[PDB]
Amino acid sequence: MLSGLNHLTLAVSQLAPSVAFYQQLLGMTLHARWDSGAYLSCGDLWLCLSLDPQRRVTPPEESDYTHYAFSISEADFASFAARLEAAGVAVWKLNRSEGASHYFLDPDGHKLELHVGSLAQRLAACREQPYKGMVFF
Amino acid sequence: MLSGLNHLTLAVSQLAPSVAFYQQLLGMTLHARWDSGAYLSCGDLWLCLSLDPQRRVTPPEESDYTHYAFSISEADFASFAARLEAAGVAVWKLNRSEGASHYFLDPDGHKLELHVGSLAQRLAACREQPYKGMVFF
Ligand SMILES: COc1ccc2c(c1)NCCO2
Ligand SMILES: [Mn+2]
Ligand SMILES: [Mn+2]
Structure with a gap:
């Protein structure tokens, strides 16, 4: 049985501006960042930004x-x-x-x-x- | 501030098979369905399926x-x-x-x-x- 949304992952073309947008502009909490992505939270929402050259x-x-x-x-x-x-x-x-x-x-x-x-x-x-x-x- | 995901809306090309997938196959709860969409929940998640000719x-x-x-x-x-x-x-x-x-x-x-x-x-x-x-x- 599915119990909720576990996470939302957005493919991003450039990690730094996307982190700036979600963390600084939108106020989400940045928990971790690596060379190709980041994890943020917004209330219960787990957001992943994934650097993807196909975006x-x-x-x-x-x-x-x-x-x-x-x-x-x-x-x-x-x-x-x-x-x-x-x-x-x-x-x-x-x-x-x-x-x-x-x-x-x-x-x-x-x-x-x-x-x-x-x-x-x-x-x-x-x-x-x-x-x-x-x-x- | 922002407090979580209010809803996820997925554009769908054919409403009936999409409703069947999320409700029958994945077990989500169907609350309402109309000619152009449906509302389901999965735990606390509000999922909207929106019929979109562009999908x-x-x-x-x-x-x-x-x-x-x-x-x-x-x-x-x-x-x-x-x-x-x-x-x-x-x-x-x-x-x-x-x-x-x-x-x-x-x-x-x-x-x-x-x-x-x-x-x-x-x-x-x-x-x-x-x-x-x-x-x-
Ligand atoms: C609008 O709600 C419904 C609900 C069930 C249905 C249909 C519509 N259409 C035919 C197949 O079963
Ligand atoms: Mn994932
Ligand atoms: Mn909406």
């Missing part, structure tokens, strides 16, 4: 919707978004769903999101206003 | 090392991996470079992993068998 710096129009959302409180959301904006971090989508969301790109074009709200909150909103074809289990 | 079925030699690992106990690991193998689930990696792991592909070629152990346990193992150039903070 392309990918424009958002050229990647699919796969993305990674990090939790933040409503109270902290606006100042964190403003920090990313000050740093010139690109946005790949505007929010049109329930719960605050800020959609931003990492240095290699990995699609990231800041989101406020749980699955339970999303399901409660969907029960009141179901998406087209929606069934609950 | 391509991608062979593992064409994608970078970005991957998603799910936690499993030492007692359950081998039989779960063997069941995936017997079910014909494609693989993408054999060498255990980060501990007890089984590397397998979803229907669209998303790179998945079963892993036994926490970040703390991986750091302890790396102290004895470190990656080249490894520094611990």
Whole structure:
């Protein structure tokens, strides 16, 4: 039986700017670094950055919707978004769903999101206003 | 600050086979499904499957090392991996470079992993068998 997400690994083209982005800009804790990667944590999340020459710096129009959302409180959301904006971090989508969301790109074009709200909150909103074809289990 | 992974969203090319893979084959809990997506949980992980016409079925030699690992106990690991193998689930990696792991592909070629152990346990193992150039903070 699977019990959760064990780790998220992102392939990166240049390790130093990716470590700067996740540790310094995004505030994650750096636990270890080696010649070809790094381990960070963000709350319960174990993040691995893996240096990979096959990673392309990918424009958002050229990647699919796969993305990674990090939790933040409503109270902290606006100042964190403003920090990313000050740093010139690109946005790949505007929010049109329930719960605050800020959609931003990492240095290699990995699609990231800041989101406020749980699955339970999303399901409660969907029960009141179901998406087209929606069934609950 | 950021406090963890709020959700993982995977773009999928065909919703029904992807729901079947994560719910039936991997045992995740299906909470809701609509014409363009599904919400599942795996322990505390919120997984969204999002139907995306841009998603391509991608062979593992064409994608970078970005991957998603799910936690499993030492007692359950081998039989779960063997069941995936017997079910014909494609693989993408054999060498255990980060501990007890089984590397397998979803229907669209998303790179998945079963892993036994926490970040703390991986750091302890790396102290004895470190990656080249490894520094611990
Ligand atoms: C929308 O939820 C569902 C749930 C089960 C289904 C289908 C949709 N479609 C046909 C196969 O079984
Ligand atoms: Mn999202
Ligand atoms: Mn891994």
